Amino acid sequence: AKLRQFYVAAQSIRWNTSFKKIVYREYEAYFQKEKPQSRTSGLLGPTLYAEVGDIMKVHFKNKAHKPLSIHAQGIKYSKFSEGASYSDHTLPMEKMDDAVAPGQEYTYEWIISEHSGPTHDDPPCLTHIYYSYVNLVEDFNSGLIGPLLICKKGTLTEDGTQKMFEKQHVLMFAVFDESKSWNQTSSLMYTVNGYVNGTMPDITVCAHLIGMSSGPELFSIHFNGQVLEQNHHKISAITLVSATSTTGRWTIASLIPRHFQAGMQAYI
Amino acid sequence: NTGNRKYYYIAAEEISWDYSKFVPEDTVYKKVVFRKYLDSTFTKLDPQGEYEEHLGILGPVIRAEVDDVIQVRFKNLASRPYSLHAHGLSNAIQPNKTYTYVWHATTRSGPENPGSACRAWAYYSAVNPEKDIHSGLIGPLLICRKGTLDKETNMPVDMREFVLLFMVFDEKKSWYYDNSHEFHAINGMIYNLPGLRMYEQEWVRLHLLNLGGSRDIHVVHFHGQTLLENGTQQHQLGVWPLLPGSFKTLEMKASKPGWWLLDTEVGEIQRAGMQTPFLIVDRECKMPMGLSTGLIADSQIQASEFWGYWEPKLARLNNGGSYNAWIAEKLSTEFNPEPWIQVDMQKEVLLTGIQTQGAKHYLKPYYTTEFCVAYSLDRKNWRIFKGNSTRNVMYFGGNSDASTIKENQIDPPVVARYIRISPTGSYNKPALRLELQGCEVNGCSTPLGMESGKIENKQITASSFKKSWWGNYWEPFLARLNAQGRVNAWQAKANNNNQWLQIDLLKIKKITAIVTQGCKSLSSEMYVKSYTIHYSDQGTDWKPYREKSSMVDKIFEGNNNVRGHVKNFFNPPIISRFIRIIPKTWNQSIALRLELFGCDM
Ligand SMILES: *[C@@H]1O[C@H](CO)[C@@H](O)[C@H](O)[C@H]1NC(C)=O
Ligand SMILES: *[C@@H]1O[C@H](CO)[C@@H](O)[C@H](O)[C@H]1NC(C)=O
Ligand SMILES: *[C@@H]1O[C@H](CO)[C@@H](O)[C@H](O)[C@H]1NC(C)=O
Ligand SMILES: *[C@H]1O[C@H](CO)[C@@H](O)[C@H](O)[C@H]1NC(C)=O
Ligand SMILES: *[C@H]1O[C@H](CO)[C@@H](O)[C@H](O)[C@H]1NC(C)=O
Ligand SMILES: [Ca+2]
Ligand SMILES: [Cu+2]
């Protein structure tokens, strides 16, 4: 029943032309420096993970020019660790977790419990996602977002990695629209981790999907290798929708009249 | 051999519907909805209880077990033709005209062999599906497996079902008759859908149904909660992809009190209104509201009439005496609720139970054998409570004798500031000594362990205590609110000013209030009249509780009598492990019996 630590922060960063965007970055110790990841994971934020019982603690330090927050969509949090703002009638001591001002740093404390994690008939580790609630249409679009993974007993590594499975990736078929964000910049862009038709560092094989999009949307990720096994049975392809995540050289395209015919493809 | 017929008399009616009502600027459109009537005449309608207040725009929930036979008498009181199609069976009815349908709930309609006792489907007009659903003619249809429904068709087991329809109503497709007239709603309500209340750590069953177009797609998200897929397979989802034309059922175990939000989390839509708060009540919300302990003042009690000398101020559970209860000369209260006693909490609270008792002149018994309970937030609009009730309203069963206490639950917790009780049956005269039960609406307001024992003795330690050689020892760990017997409290060995009683909450808790009580032993009424609170996290070092702005310590007014209770709330909660009560003033001797309030963190 260990304890997990993270010191992810929010910061603006130019991004492939280019635009001024915001993204979540790992950072370490007491926020000295980050250890980026060029290999894919474009705009995709970190990747938070824990195991049943692990009283994890996520430290957040905002650096963007708009107040933001950490809104995990997969944990049984409390009011002072939720990450959203609405009339919940709570007192300010509990309101200072909803909105973190440009330059302040607060720590969300999530007590990921037993009856809040994987079942027994489901993957060894459930996949969820997080983003900033302070503003839903902006924050995400401005590049904010990030995978969360709740695992079972002795299934995660002591160094934050998949166990008896190892080498799982995190594709984020997520269409962006700069028209709805930081700047009034008219630019649609069906991506796959930010990267459009290409320019996405794939990775050959020695033999954890997400699907954001702010508006109504469904993604049909079609793999080209029978490695997609859902539970105890394979499926040709996987389907995702606007905010629903799921847990060699080939291509991974989405055969949909506006996804594969617009660049959305992550070559295996 | 079941084949039980389930009768329903449902009509289609034109009404004005105001989306947003409980939140825009003028969002009311003419609409047509499924309304539930009491019988074939379609004269009097079946009032909508507290159990289906969240239904909103939806019609009454047709329900049935397998092999059952559903017979619905559709009237249709609208201006044009409409119909009642039951999606899942396995012709346009003209205005002002009736027509009976007959559906046989086959096994193909029921749930799966493993989980969730009941499965969701939906009924709606079909003359022109789209233009009709968008007009408001849609309702939930549930099919359960044998033995799930009770004599008067409701779920008893998992119990607590909810039916949320995530959909966009485009008034541009109905009685338009003639801008974006679209409403990203839940049960036809935007931003706020009332009626969603459940208990902390309680299993509720959700029936999610989306009958909208292709551009719908709604990701239902229950904040701070975790949805469960029960079937031949179990999966723990954190949000659920609700696709068009789909119906899905998945339980959920609510966790932690407070107001949480419910939304589609497809950002653009959620902000347009597809969201609503939903309330989770404290697990042990059923504490005395104050009639029997003194917390509720005589001022707050008031009746419409009382039989000479049996004044309302007297209706308090257990209060004894020659005149110790409220009695009305007549309970003529029929389709009238005139004979009533009103309790005003002065503020809104959660009511989850009611206890009644009778009175006894001398040997002549007096008691209520039946009553009704009405509530209001303003004092202007009342609502007669219903729930299980097979009648238009709940007719609670009263007392049998004049001394025993009769316990009555409130099916679904209700929010109210004014509770109005009125006797509808009695033996001689409707006498009533009563107590209301509940808690604070915002939760985190239940006892911490003083009165139950969860807080063990080896946790309460005071500066000094008494031990008179006459076998009378008043150890500190006896300051347990509502103590009885030999030495029932804490006695300060000295009655000076720097004495203290402290409790070890063993962990840091959220302290929201405190209740103090004196002691009447050895024929001497002694009690703490005023105190001050000090809290510690590690043990030593104390910080005198002070107001929102000051440097002087806080002076909490205590009790003014031996048995009465007095409650004090901490505006800003106390977050600590150690709490200290510092008597500052008193009467005759410093003694105590107390209880704290708050929750885990
Ligand atoms: C976005 O456009 C520029 C970036 O090229 C930026 O400096 C400016 O603040 C923004 N202006 C708008 C469109 O609001
Ligand atoms: C390339 O990608 C952009 C957005 O990522 C898209 O607008 C364009 O149609 C794509 N080109 C094609 C047709 O492959
Ligand atoms: C799952 O379904 C079974 C079968 O009806 C039921 O007994 C059980 O209570 C359900 N579990 C939960 C927690 O909903
Ligand atoms: C009942 O509704 C029908 C349909 O418009 C109408 O013909 C009839 O007059 C109504 N009943 C009366 C007489 O008010
Ligand atoms: C409500 O009233 C009593 C208490 O359980 C019982 O007869 C009835 O079944 C309850 N309602 C439900 C939904 O079980
Ligand atoms: Ca909060
Ligand atoms: Cu949400």
Curated annotation (Swiss-Prot), chain B:
It comes from Bos taurus. Cu cation binds at residues 221, 223, 263. Disulfide bonds join 118-144, 285-439, 444-599. Residues 4-144, 154-281 form the Plastocyanin-like domain. Residues 285-439, 444-599 form the F5/8 type C domain. Residues 4-281 form the F5/8 type A domain. Glycans are attached at residues 96, 230, 388, 587. This is Coagulation factor V light chain.
